[PDB]
Amino acid sequence: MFEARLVQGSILKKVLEALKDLINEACWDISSSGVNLQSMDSSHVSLVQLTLRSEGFDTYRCDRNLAMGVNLTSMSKILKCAGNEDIITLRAEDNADTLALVFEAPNQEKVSDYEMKLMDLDVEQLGIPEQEYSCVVKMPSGEFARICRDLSHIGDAVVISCAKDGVKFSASGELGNGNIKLSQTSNVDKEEEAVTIEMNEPVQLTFALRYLNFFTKATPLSSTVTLSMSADVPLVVEYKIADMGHLKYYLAPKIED
Amino acid sequence: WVDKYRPCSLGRLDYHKEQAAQLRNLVQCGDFPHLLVYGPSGAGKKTRIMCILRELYGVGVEKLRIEHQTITTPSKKKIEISTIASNYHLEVNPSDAGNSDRVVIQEMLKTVAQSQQLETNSQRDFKVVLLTEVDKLTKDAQHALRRTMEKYMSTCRLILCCNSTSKVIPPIRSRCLAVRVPAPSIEDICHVLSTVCKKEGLNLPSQLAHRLAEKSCRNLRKALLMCEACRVQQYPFTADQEIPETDWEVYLRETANAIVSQQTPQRLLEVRGRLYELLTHCIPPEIIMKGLLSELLHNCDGQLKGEVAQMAAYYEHRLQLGSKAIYHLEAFVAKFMALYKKFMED
Amino acid sequence: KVENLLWVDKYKPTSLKTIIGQQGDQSCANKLLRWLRNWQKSSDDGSSFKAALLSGPPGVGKTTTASLVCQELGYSYVELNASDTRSKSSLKAIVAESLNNTSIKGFYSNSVSTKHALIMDEVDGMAGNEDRGGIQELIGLIKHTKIPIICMCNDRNHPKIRSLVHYCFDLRFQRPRVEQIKGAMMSIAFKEGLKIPPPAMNEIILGANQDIRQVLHNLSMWCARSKALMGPFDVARKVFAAGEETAHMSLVDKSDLFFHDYSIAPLFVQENYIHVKPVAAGGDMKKHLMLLSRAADSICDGDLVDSQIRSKQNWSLLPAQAIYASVLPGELMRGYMTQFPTFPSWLGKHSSTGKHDRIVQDLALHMSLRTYSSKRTVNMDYLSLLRDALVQPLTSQGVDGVQDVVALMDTYYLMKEDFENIMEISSWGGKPSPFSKPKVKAAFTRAY
Amino acid sequence: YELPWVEKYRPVKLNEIVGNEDTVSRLEVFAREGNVPNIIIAGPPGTGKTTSILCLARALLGPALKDAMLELNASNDRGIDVVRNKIKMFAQQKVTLPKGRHKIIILDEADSMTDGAQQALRRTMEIYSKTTRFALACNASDKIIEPIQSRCAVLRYTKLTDAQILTRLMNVIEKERVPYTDDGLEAIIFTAQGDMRQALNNLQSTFSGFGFINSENVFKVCDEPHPLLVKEMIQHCVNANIDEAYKILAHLWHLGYSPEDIIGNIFRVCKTFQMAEYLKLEFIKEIGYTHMKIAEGVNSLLQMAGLLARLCQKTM
Amino acid sequence: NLPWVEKYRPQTLNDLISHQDILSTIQKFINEDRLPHLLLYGPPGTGKTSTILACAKQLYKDKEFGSMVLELNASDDIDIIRGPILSFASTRTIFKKGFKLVILDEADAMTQDAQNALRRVIEKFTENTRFCLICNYLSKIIPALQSRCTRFRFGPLTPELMVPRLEHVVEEEKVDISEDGMKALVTLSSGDMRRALNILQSTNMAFGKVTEETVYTCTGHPLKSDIANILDWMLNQDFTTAYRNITELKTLKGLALHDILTEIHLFVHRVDFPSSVRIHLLTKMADIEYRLSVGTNEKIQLSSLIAAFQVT
Ligand SMILES: Nc1ncnc2c1ncn2[C@@H]1O[C@H](COP(=O)(O)OP(=O)(O)OP(O)(O)=S)[C@@H](O)[C@H]1O
Ligand SMILES: Nc1ncnc2c1ncn2[C@@H]1O[C@H](COP(=O)(O)OP(=O)(O)OP(O)(O)=S)[C@@H](O)[C@H]1O
Ligand SMILES: Nc1ncnc2c1ncn2[C@@H]1O[C@H](COP(=O)(O)OP(=O)(O)OP(O)(O)=S)[C@@H](O)[C@H]1O
Ligand SMILES: Nc1ncnc2c1ncn2[C@@H]1O[C@H](COP(=O)(O)OP(=O)(O)O)[C@@H](O)[C@H]1O
Ligand SMILES: [Mg+2]
């Protein structure tokens, strides 16, 4: 039996509204170490890796390593039934067909125990190796979301150029051209908004904006987004969780001529 | 060169000159009516129609294109049709849609009527919707044609190019000026052949042109093709050329001769194979029946010809009611064998 | 141990040398393999296309062919079935940004291989209001792509697909010959421990119309009936017998013989009634011919009833048809079948007629200078004279075949495909085309 | 509210279906071993298609029938959107069944699905065949597109002989103790025409309206042209007596029997009649011709009288 | 003003005539709460939509009649089944306890797919909604659907039964009806009380008196003497003078060839022939009718009919 009680319930909610539009159905790999989720977009262009460590869950109990396929749309539809203050308890039997989610209101007698129906998913874990990226840009999440949502109005392809002095996003569409250059920030009081660009070689890649806008749906997860990027490897948009794990999005570059 | 010497102006026609002057007077006066032009195949209905269009609109009626429209049946069986169109007319054959000929008429007439509302100013205030092969429209489609012909009378005129109007509803015959294009005489065919060869600069003699005319059987296109085909093989033109005939004429003739030769089921099976080879090449069953019946009547007795003629008429009639033509063709053959053997033996 | 898998999945073609249909030099699977292997040179004479269109009858191996081809070359494909919505908006929001993009399977593999391709299966299912504007956006994607799109259809002669074939390398799967499927299914039935007489195997393969999936499902049901311890050919042979059905059959039974497979029984009877020798007509050919004519009359009456039932769905005339097309001829031809109840062979002739029809219609539409007749013999005689026009220059002089072929091909707006169509279209009686009756044809395809 | 006999006596296991011994034998084999293929059961109405599929699904799954079976009637929305969402999410759904058992998706009235729905159902049938099995039922097996028949075993069903309907009718009578007589049972079997559900419905309606079952009473609730009158009319036509056959014909026309009904009964009676053989065939030919002419729309009494005149002049 | 086909409608269930067995059985069904789905079929004007409406008004009240009875015509439109019918049958009515009633008039104009859907709807909700289908051709109804429900053939009304109601209507109104005007009304009605009352009212309102001549002129029905004249021209004249006479009569009054042919058939059966001649007349007339059904010239078909009669 796998039972995981999480007091910070909202996290789950947010995560599922972060994936439910990029991924349609995923395979939660539960183990005594935590919860992992590696899942490729249906068009084989974007990959997502979620990790929630067992030390972040208020109570964690996994006996045998489960691998439960869920329909992330159905899971989001179930989790939308929980208030932002609820204590969420996932529970699943040895090899059950259903996953019981118990939302307990914090200070009431209202306890709502739903029972989602798992699906059959035969996915293979892609092997992503630990890399040392050329350009790592740690910026505020809202900043990146604004950048992507703005450039989506101009054109449907963002050219990211990570030079020495600062990163520069660019786009060109039938109504004109635009480019947001983003300079590194100084050692000024607030820490979260301090842009931090650590580069080794000036890289330049071209990515699709549809998937970047799918990525930015996880901005409420954390305030700082980390863009790792090297030549001819997928962009790595990483959002930390509140000391529970992380959520990384790999986006593959456009075809260069 | 069949398409290389066909005239393009009503004053340039080779035969039926009084009718040509009449048609010119018609297009000259106002309010061009709905025309129903008919007459045996290969007599010049399309030539006269194209000349009428050249007299009606400018010469821009020759710079045409080929549009491919899709129609939807009262179910999901989608059908695709071919409309040859110009800047002032549209020639569609609303019969390839086998039994969905009622919707193509409505939709095409509607589309042409609405396109004429987009600044038709060249010389006339209407367009022409030339429907070829009208006598094969279903009655439910001819009724729609009747309705949508008046519904959009003011903006588009119709020219129905059929032959042997016998299967055209009187409601239509009463709303179209009947232009009748007879088959040109033997002498007219001879004169147009001599004219074509002289413009070609050839030596077409006076005894070969007459053989071409008598073999063409008042069909001008057949005569022109035979003249062109006796040149691709033996340019010098003598009095006794072996003027060729199309492949299927020969096949249908040898099939009839085979039916006449033997009267055994082992022969009837080979005749079934021949009828399949004929049907597969998409030649109409009525043509098969008429061509078989002729060569058969050439090999019967005067007392038997009546029964055979009535048998062919009966079977052909029934074939126009069923779906699989090979059934009725083979039945006709089997019946003729059973009759001819009993006649010859006895 | 119980099996949780069908035969259609136990004995699927796990490799490429196992596709029963095509293992030849230039077949639908090797042509596609060679078009894919050197697709990079695009961005057979099909190296100029950006997409393939595998089309043909059901159950022949199109899906398996495309999957195994994309799998042998290390490609990685994204299949889009008909159970996936593919309207214009959905299509250009799902697969638009993936065509000119790199696949993440190209970096992270569990070896690593680039060359991502797309597979658009069941492209003729993109019909109806749900998939509104699918084919238009699909050709708009094919026009601007950077990865090989492999579209699969089911009937190339479709209105929506006719606007798509102009952009796709056109492959066409043939129904596999009966001997190939026979060898394969005999090997399979041997693996399974099921013994079936080869005649019954030929019967099963023919009744299923050489549909390998259907013959596999039929073998499964056969083995099921075997473990439990009347086909079309059998009933078609039981209607023209004499000696055993004297008291065994009545009008109800003879009328029921039609109802076993009432959709195909009349065709079987019309095909096999001619190989019978009426016991009533004891060798007297004058009576045997008369019985044949009477049976033919009855079969035409059955055809009339059939054409009447088809139009308005009036299933109350089924007994009348059973009387005209199956019982009557029986009593008229009640002798002894000679050889075998051969297949009706009318469906193939109707399909070939539809092919010749559309071929002639296309060739005639290109000759729309100032003359046209949709599909009549008017065009069959223009096109016979065009075939004798074309072949003449080359028959008589090798040096003028090119000049005249081009002059005519461009005077009437014709192409090389049109040439091939006009050549083996007017071959009556299996007569060889006057173009194979040598050295100039090689330079003829290369210089055109 | 008591439920009808068509349901109170519905067979709950395949040993009680009397329809087609060979096909039901195949299905019992499948209910024993357990690895069914996608099956399309096609046949005339009332013969036990829905019942066979339901009993097969029950015997396969067992107590997981609430969890592993999805039935979709003709009264349910089965457009392309339902086929792409509900049926697909059920095929993908995980249910743990014994070794050889599979989930079952019963699409009753499979001939009522539009082509788009079946096209969207093809690949769902094909992909998930490792855990999901489909069981379609239909009457017109040509309304199902060819690619769906290519991935199904097409099990044919045929009408029931009179003996089978009689056995089941006696099994029901024994349980209900309804007073009957042989002529009444022959009347019910004549009005049934193979439909085993029609026979039961007529039995229950007759018993509930009147009680005792006799032919006089059976033809008081069915009320089609009494086969004795039609037999007498055909007999007069055999003796070349037109003026005495038109008598019965105009009598039947007086009571307002539609000519389609008159021709249906004339055919069904002239088929199993006691004439010669050649004469019977010469009669059935003309009756078929007139049936064609009436289905086409020429349904006046003059056409029936012309049919009688032809039948008379066949026997000089 | 108000038509007599509505003023004299049978308001109760016993005011129905000529169907005493069916009416008694339906009344017994009502008394015992055993009312099954009903299929009322038969020729027009015989009392179907009145039988079921009387049964309804006996079953519900007049204020429950809007929320528990769905009177739906089937000739307006598969969507009608899963639409209003499935949404009416599946839902309860809030405060009323008891089944509902759905009355599908013209239930044979439904396509076969709609009848499959409706058969499943019926089979499902069979204890809170009773269906009553109404049709003229039971042959048009799918055998599946008809199996579900008990069938009642409302045949035509014999003239003995229907004459008393016409006599009551005549006495209640003021119609000076002759002793044969009633006969020429019963004959032309052909056994549907609606047409009988309609013809009677319209003729009494147009001419003012009903007799054997006035009704024949108000309905334009070909008089018996005219058809006798035509048969005499055909039977006792030259071919050409019969063609001329028949054409002149056929154009004098509005007369087609279908009606000529029908009446001439009835006469062929009336008058005495050698009984081997009427086999020929009947065959030829039944072929001429088929020939006319396909849209042919009537000038060649009339001549064919005269040729048929020239066997004499
Ligand atoms: N050439 C073949 N060789 C071996 N098995 C075959 C072959 N063709 C079909 N099969 C079998 O039939 C099954 C289905 O074949 P598919 O290739 O899926 O048919 P299909 O061409 O997709 O037909 P559609 O999609 O209905 S038009 C496979 O799983 C194989 O078991
Ligand atoms: N072969 C049979 N053996 C026993 N009872 C049968 C048989 N066929 C039908 N029945 C009875 O008839 C009832 C209805 O039969 P169904 O299984 O509904 O037939 P069906 O094939 O569904 O007919 P449709 O769906 O209208 S085409 C069942 O509840 C049984 O009581
Ligand atoms: N048995 C009857 N008793 C009394 N009046 C009747 C009877 N039958 C018909 N009528 C009268 O005829 C009129 C029409 O009868 P309806 O019941 O409407 O016939 P109908 O069966 O509905 O015909 P349809 O709907 O066109 S098939 C009614 O208004 C009554 O006045
Ligand atoms: N007046 C004419 N002068 C010369 N050739 C003609 C004339 N009329 C018809 N033709 C010949 O007939 C050919 C086509 O006949 P067409 O006009 O199509 O008649 P139909 O429509 O009956 O076949 C033309 O290409 C031309 O060769
Ligand atoms: Mg496939």
Ligand SMILES: [Mg+2]
């Ligand atoms: Mg059923």
Ligand SMILES: [Mg+2]
């Ligand atoms: Mg009514």
